[PDB]
Design a binder for this molecule. Structure first.
Ligand code: CU
Ligand code: CU
Ligand code: CU
Ligand code: CU
Ligand code: CU
Ligand code: CU
Lengths: 286, 288
């Protein structure tokens, strides 16, 4: 109830500038690379082995994993500059924009712009432009040059809308068997975006394109975290509406997916991050 | 300074039995594969990106990373059976046998035997034989079963010796610049095995063969942990003998290799694990 995560569009110029600079310090120090690797490591831990489920996606842990993931990243931000909190990209308001590329999140003092088509959609503006920000491939080796390409795939031409979010918030159960991509009437899976997908969380990823478009490499782009803060916010809201609803599966799901299972690559459990206000933060909607 | 790690040679038949049982329960529960995946992930975290050093291997954190790795694994053992500690494979003693492959470590009540050359060196004896124990590959998906092929390469025809260990215990610097495979007069690099490699710790990997011969997939074989318990024992002896001498680099090394850097995949630092007794355990040779 003390660290405030604000809407990106409500940040001051000094807030935008300070957040971007802590991120760059985290990159220069080698700490930011830890999160790219954690995320790529979580994607090849199948629960159980041979399953399409993994520790961080395509199953019930999707939401608590990224909550814990954002929680650590913001802790690393705060250790450099204690004023800094993780902002959230309310992409569902930007979807009403006649041209969402022109939103202030993409301004040159924050995330920088869309990909440049003549340079193969290499990002050449803002603080994470090529030559200012070096990316990493799946196998931990340099791959030179952030890329984006907004709305360029047929399956995700538009950002998810407010009605998408309101509809997801209606779903009555956190998750349902078989706790994977096929789960029906499941808030986790609906928000993750596999209900007639890509929608919501999956749809944003494909919309940004670039590394943001392939899940193992998506945290190469700083907007990933701003994206997932919003996903964490929607979850926070859902938990306050369906108060008498808790995590599922409680047990008898694959190991790593149950309420008290450690979430690879950590020992942190879903129960550990159920209450975000006890984790030290709130969203600027109270 | 209380949990005692025993030489595999001095283990009772019931200690061999309970330890195997515990490893199999960790496997069944999903816990063992976290260790496998942790080791692969460490191998992809290069320090820095593009370097041939990684978080767990080929740089200075080699030694503390595995100490933490084994300490975690041992705690997971304790949680299933509080009497079980991690034993160590004193491979320098095995190398003295005319034929090290007859060592009791490889018996059918413990680790099981060599691979079957008719079955592409799949292990078909012991509690980790194919069809009782499932390996996973670098992508977290089942592979065919444990493999071993003892001493089959030209570079590692034999296990490291007593003199190889004593010769390493002589070196006074923990590590040297450039904190990597090329470090000279480096305890870390000598013990890891890159001085006229493969020696010592790398030699053991390459002599076992199978999954043990491929550092990323090595923990699919539970003897990996008995191996590293021995490496950790040797470093611990080095610390008792060179008490003035500390970890290096203190600072100015690549991030993830300095004394107070987190060791990916964890936040544990080398400082956190320097004193093995303050982690709760000792090796039997300390107790006489
Ligand atoms: Cu996979
Ligand atoms: Cu993710
Ligand atoms: Cu995501
Ligand atoms: Cu690599
Ligand atoms: Cu290793
Ligand atoms: Cu090893």
């Amino acid at each position: 109830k003390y660290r405030v995560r604000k809407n990106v569009l409500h940040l001051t110029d000094t807030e935008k500038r300070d957040f971007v600079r802590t991120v760059l310090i985290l990159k220069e120090k080698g700490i930011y690379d830890r999160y790219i690797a954690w995320h790529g490591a979580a994607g090849k831990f199948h629960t159980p082995p041979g399953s399409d489920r993994n520790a961080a996606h395509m199953s019930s842990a999707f939401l608590p994993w990224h909550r814990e993931y954002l929680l650590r990243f913001e802790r690393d931000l705060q250790s450099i500059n204690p004023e800094v909190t993780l902002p959230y990209w309310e992409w569902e308001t930007d979807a009403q924009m006649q041209d969402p590329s022109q939103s202030q999140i993409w301004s040159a003092d924050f995330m920088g712009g869309n990909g440049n088509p003549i340079k193969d959609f290499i990002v050449d503006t803002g603080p994470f432009a090529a030559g200012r920000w070096t990316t990493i491939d799946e196998q931990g080796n340099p791959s030179g040059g952030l890329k984006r390409n907004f709305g360029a795939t047929k399956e995700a031409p538009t950002l998810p809308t407010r009605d998408d979010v309101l509809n997801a918030l209606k779903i009555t159960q956190y998750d349902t068997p078989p706790w994977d991509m096929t789960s029906q009437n499941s808030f986790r899976n609906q928000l993750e975006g596999f209900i007639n997908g890509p929608q919501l969380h999956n749809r944003v990823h494909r919309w940004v394109g670039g590394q943001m478009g392939v899940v193992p490499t998506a945290p190469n782009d700083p907007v990933y975290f701003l994206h997932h803060a919003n996903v964490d916010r929607i979850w926070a809201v859902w938990q306050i509406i369906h108060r008498n609803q808790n995590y599922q599966p409680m047990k008898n799901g694959p190991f790593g997916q149950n309420f008290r299972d450690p979430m690879y690559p950590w020992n942190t459990t879903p129960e550990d991050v159920m209450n975000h206000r006890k984790l030290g933060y709130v969203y600027d909607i109270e």
